[PDB]
Design a binder for this molecule. Structure first.
Ligand SMILES: Cc1cc2nc3c(=O)[nH]c(=O)nc-3n(C[C@H](O)[C@H](O)[C@H](O)COP(=O)(O)OP(=O)(O)OC[C@H]3O[C@@H](n4cnc5c(N)ncnc54)[C@H](O)[C@@H]3O)c2cc1C
Ligand SMILES: O=C(O)c1cc(Oc2ccc(C(F)(F)F)cc2Cl)ccc1[N+](=O)[O-]
Length: 414
């Protein structure tokens, strides 16, 4: 009876754990699997807290619906009876002192192919280099750059074209809170020995088995290992492997998320839409601001207005250290500059993410390939995936974990 240990209890490890069991009980494989999680809870980046009839997503808000792996899991986990799409609306981009809106199918699918031709060279390059090469700087700075930074929390002059938009070579959630998706999995796991509050500190080789040194001192044995912990932790369990250097040299920008609850002192700004992002040249502290209510009404109790502001950006990310006070102050200080805030926030929830935004820079795919290959020839049966490899989005993480299950089995049986 072969053993497989999954390291990391976020969505990737959980996804791997869930589809691993589904496989062990459909081919009746002599496999016994266990999952180790460092923190006392499972779900990692996915955290949903409730306060005063509110539902605030400290981190992962929702997920792209077109990515099957995500809603698909929801079904298998039996939870479609909670899926709620986002309530569309207009968005804006605060340039200097003005809320401009985005511009006004077939004409769009074609305007893009004209504006953004496919890549000439086959060498990786930065998103900034790619755009700046075919559109004016002003455009990149005031429109493209603000958006991209908003969904990668990175520096576009560093981010890889190949790893973020390989194609150059509408959202769902759970009315109960994304965190339920995580809890639902933990409960439906039967053959998996889920150990929390324990961290793997070293990956090694015994005789015919792999040896996993734990926090406490216990040592587990395994024939196959799926590592889903973030680049820093992972690179630590295999510091000797030369290619692991790619993993430990990665960067994860720090960012802050601030939820705000208002009875009505909100008094809409000039315009009225889902939210907006701030352009580089704008000397603002906040990065973006979304009206949670408008998009996800089920978040805030009727009569209440729930806002969400993001802070911290690649480069100047020191704002994440200041106290809730300093943050919640800086947010309103800036927030008030484009809307009237009569009164004070009834509810306030700050939440920091120190190095939680994995950054894929130019050459990311090549380096990841080398690592996979190095691991294939020196550590057969060991696999590393997750937001640090190919895709930070929840859907992407789910299959990365699915692919891991696939590989591990092939190696073990097939
Ligand atoms: C603030 C924030 C907002 C986000 N918003 C969105 C969004 O709106 N939409 C979207 O699609 N994505 C969003 N994301 C991204 C998404 O949450 C991640 O891509 C995804 O959760 C990564 O999952 P993972 O399982 O690979 O890793 P993680 O969730 O990081 O989990 C890895 C696990 O490894 C454990 N671990 C680490 N070291 C050890 C050790 N030594 N031993 C045992 N366990 C260990 C950790 O405790 C952790 O639970 C957001 C992320 C953040 C931080
Ligand atoms: O950086 C992320 O982890 C993160 C990814 C998202 O996933 C997408 C964002 C934008 C798009 C786009 F641009 F194609 F619409 C697709 C996806 Cl899957 C959304 C939001 C965030 N975020 O940090 O706020």
């Amino acid at each position: 009876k072969k053993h497989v240990v999954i390291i990391g209890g976020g969505i990737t490890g959980l996804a791997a754990a869930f589809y691993m069991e589904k496989e062990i009980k459909e081919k009746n494989l002599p496999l016994e699997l266990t999952l180790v999680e460092a923190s006392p809870r499972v779900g990692g980046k996915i955290q949903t807290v409730k306060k005063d009839g509110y539902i605030i997503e400290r981190g992962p808000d929702s997920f792209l619906e077109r990515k099957k792996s995500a809603p698909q899991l929801v079904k298998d986990l039996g939870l479609e009876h909670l899926l709620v799409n986002n309530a569309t609306g207009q968005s804006y981009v605060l340039v200097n002192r003005t809320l401009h809106p985005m511009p006004k199918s077939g004409k769009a699918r074609a305007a893009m192919d004209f504006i953004l031709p496919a890549s000439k060279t086959k060498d990786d390059q930065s998103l900034g280099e790619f755009f700046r090469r075919r559109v004016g700087d002003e455009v990149v700075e005031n429109l493209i750059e603000p958006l991209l930074s908003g969904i990668y929390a990175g520096d576009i002059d560093k981010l890889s074209l190949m790893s973020t938009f390989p194609q150059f070579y509408q959202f769902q959630t759970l009315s109960t809170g994304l965190q339920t998706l995580v809890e639902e999995i933990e409960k439906q796991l039967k053959l998996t020995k889920v150990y929390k509050g324990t961290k793997v500190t070293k990956l090694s080789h015994s005789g015919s088995c792999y040896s996993l040194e734990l926090d406490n001192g216990v040592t587990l044995d395994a024939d196959s290992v799926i590592v889903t912990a973030p680049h820093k932790a992972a690179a630590g369990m295999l510091s000797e492997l030369p290619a692991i250097s790619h993993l430990k040299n990665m960067h994860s920008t720090s960012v802050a998320n601030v939820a705000l609850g208002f009875p009505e002192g909100s008094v809409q700004m000039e315009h009225e839409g889902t939210g907006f992002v701030i352009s580089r040249n704008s000397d603002f502290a906040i990065t973006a601001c979304t009206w949670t209510n408008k998009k996800w009404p089920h978040a805030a109790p009727e009569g209440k207005t729930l806002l969400r502001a993001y802070v911290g950006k690649a480069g100047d990310e020191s704002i994440v250290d200041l106290s809730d006070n300093d943050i919640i102050n800086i947010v309103l200080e800036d927030l008030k500059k484009v809307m009237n805030i009569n009164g004070e926030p009834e509810m306030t929830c700050v939440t920091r993410w120190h190095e939680s935004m994995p950054q894929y820079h130019v050459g990311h795919k090549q380096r990841i390939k080398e690592l996979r290959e190095a691991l294939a020839s020196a550590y057969p049966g060991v696999y590393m995936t997750g937001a640090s490899f190919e895709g930070v989005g929840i859907p992407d993480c789910i299959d990365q974990g699915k692919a891991a299950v696939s590989d591990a089995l092939t190696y073990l049986f097939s």
